[PDB]
Design brief:
It is found in: Periplasm. Belongs to the bacterial solute-binding protein 5 family. It comes from Agrobacterium fabrum (strain C58 / ATCC 33970) (Agrobacterium tumefaciens (strain C58)). The two termini are about 15 Å apart. The protein has 16 helices and 20 strands. The protein has three domains: about 160 residues, 3-Layer(aba) Sandwich (D-Maltodextrin-Binding Protein, domain 2); about 120 residues, Dipeptide-binding Protein, domain 1, CATH 3.90.76.10; about 210 residues, Dipeptide-binding Protein, domain 3 (Roll). It has a seven-stranded mixed beta sheet, with helices on both faces. A five-stranded mixed beta sheet has the order 15-14-16-13-17. By secondary structure, it is α+β, with helices and mostly antiparallel strands. The chain binds the ligand C[C@H](OP(=O)(O)O[C@@H]1[C@@H](O)[C@H](O)[C@@H](CO)O[C@H]1O)C(O)O and sodium ion. The site of sodium ion has 5 residues, from loops. The site of ligand H6Q has 11 residues, from strand 16 and helix 13.
Length: about 500
Amino acid sequence: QERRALRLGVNGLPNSLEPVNAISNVGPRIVNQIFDTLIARDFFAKGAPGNAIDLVPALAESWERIDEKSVRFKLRQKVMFHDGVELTADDVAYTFSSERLWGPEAIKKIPLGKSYSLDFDEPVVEDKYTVTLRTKTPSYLIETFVASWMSRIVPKEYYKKLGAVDFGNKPVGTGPYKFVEFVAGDRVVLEANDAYWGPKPTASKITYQIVAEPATRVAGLISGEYDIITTLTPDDIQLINSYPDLETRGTLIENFHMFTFNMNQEVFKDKKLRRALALAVNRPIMVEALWKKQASIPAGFNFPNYGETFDPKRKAMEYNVEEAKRLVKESGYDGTPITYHTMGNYYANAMPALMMMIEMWKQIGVNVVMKTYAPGSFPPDNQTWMRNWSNGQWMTDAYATIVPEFGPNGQVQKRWGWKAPAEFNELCQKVTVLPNGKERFDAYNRMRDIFEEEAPAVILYQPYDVYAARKDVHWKPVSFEMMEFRNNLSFG
Ligand SMILES: C[C@H](OP(=O)(O)O[C@@H]1[C@@H](O)[C@H](O)[C@@H](CO)O[C@H]1O)C(O)O
Ligand code: NA
C-alpha cells in the first residue's frame, strides 16, 4: 500500500526547529529534512563511504565566485516552500541578512548568529532568481559557509510574520519532509513532501522519539519499536550484531567531544588548574576502555577536514601527571569538590568518560563530582564549573570552530569568561581575512599552541558515531552529526 513510516529512537531533541538555533548534535538530523541549502555536500560522491567532501548544486543550480569578497548564485526555479510560496532571491537575501542573522538586531532571535557568521555585508538581489552573498573584508570561506548548517534557507514572509520563536515551533522549508508536530522534550513528527524539487521522499512519515537512556534505546530496537537508533557506544556492537535482523552502522564524524570551564568562577579565572586537569587526562586509556579503539585523538585543535589548514606534523596534546600535580599546588587549590555538569548520556560515553576522568583527577589531588541535568534543564551559568560539550567542525577550513567558538566575538570569551591573550585574538582577526598560505598556516598553529597553553576547553577525541538499524532499513551514516535520507533511504 503506502510507503513505510520511519521510527527513530534518538538521544535528544533540539528546543527549536529554527535551523540556526537547532545547531547541535540532535537538531541537524531533523532540520536537514525540513530545509535545503544553496550548495550541498555530497558525502557519497564517487562511491565514497559517506565521507566525501564534494560540494554540489542544491537550491542554487549554479554559482560563481566574483572576487575575494563575493559569490553570485543562480537559483533553481519553481521551487516551493511547504506552504506553497515559491523560493526567490528575496528569501535567500533574508536568510543571510543583518536583520535575521548577523547584525546586532539578530542577537535576540539567533543568539549565536553574529558570532558564527562571516563578516557579511548585506546580500545583493539582482533578480527573482539571482542573489550575491558578500563580505565587508576578504573571505575565501563563503562557499563552505553556504554549504553548512548555518545556511538552511528560510521563507522571508512566513518567518517575519511568525517571528524566530513561533517559526521554531512551526517550521516551513523547501526540504523533502514537512512539519507535522513537535512535543518539546518528547517527539518531532515529519511527513513526506511529495512536491519536493529533488529526490522524492521514500518514507511516508518520520518520527524522532526521545529515548534518553541508551539501554532503553537498544531494547526498543530489539523489540521492533524503532527502525534506527542513535548515539550508541562501541560496547553495544557485539550484542546488537548477535541479532541476525539487526546491525550497527558507525563512522568517525567531523566533531570533537570535550570538557570546558565556566571561567567566570574564581577557581577557573586563571589557567593553572584548567591546565592541571588537561595534563592529567589519559586519552589513549579512555579510547581503549570505552571506545574499543574506534575514537580518534587529534593533535590539538586540528582536523583533516581543515584541508590546507590541517597540520599532519603536529605533536600529540601533552600528558604529564607530574607537571599536573605541580600545577595543582601552584594554583592554590584547597581540595574543595568541583562540579562537572552532564545531560546524562546525551554524548555517547559522557558519564563513563567522566567516571574515568574523576579517578585520574583524584590521583593529582583534585576532587571532581558529577552533576546530572534533565533535557532542556541546563542550570544557570553561575551554578556550573566544569561541563562537557562538543564541536562539529562545520567548514573545509581551520576557521571553524576555533574562531566562531573561542574567538574574540565568541561565547567562550564573552559568555563563559575566557580572558584570552591579546595575541590569540590578533591571530583570530588575521586568519579571518588572509588567503591560504604560509602566514595563515603558521597563525593557526600559534593559535593551537595558545589554546593548549590556556586550556579554555580540553579536547578529548573525535567520537565514533554508532547507530543501530534493522537490516531491512537501508541507510548509510555520513561523517557529520546529521542523518541524510536523500537517495539514502529504502525499505525491504
Ligand atoms: C549542548 C548542545 O551542544 P552540542 O555539543 O550538541 O552541539 C554543538 C554546538 O553547541 C556547537 O555550536 C557546534 C559547533 O561548534 O557543534 C555542535 O556539536 C547545544 O548546542 O544544544
Ligand atoms: Na530519496
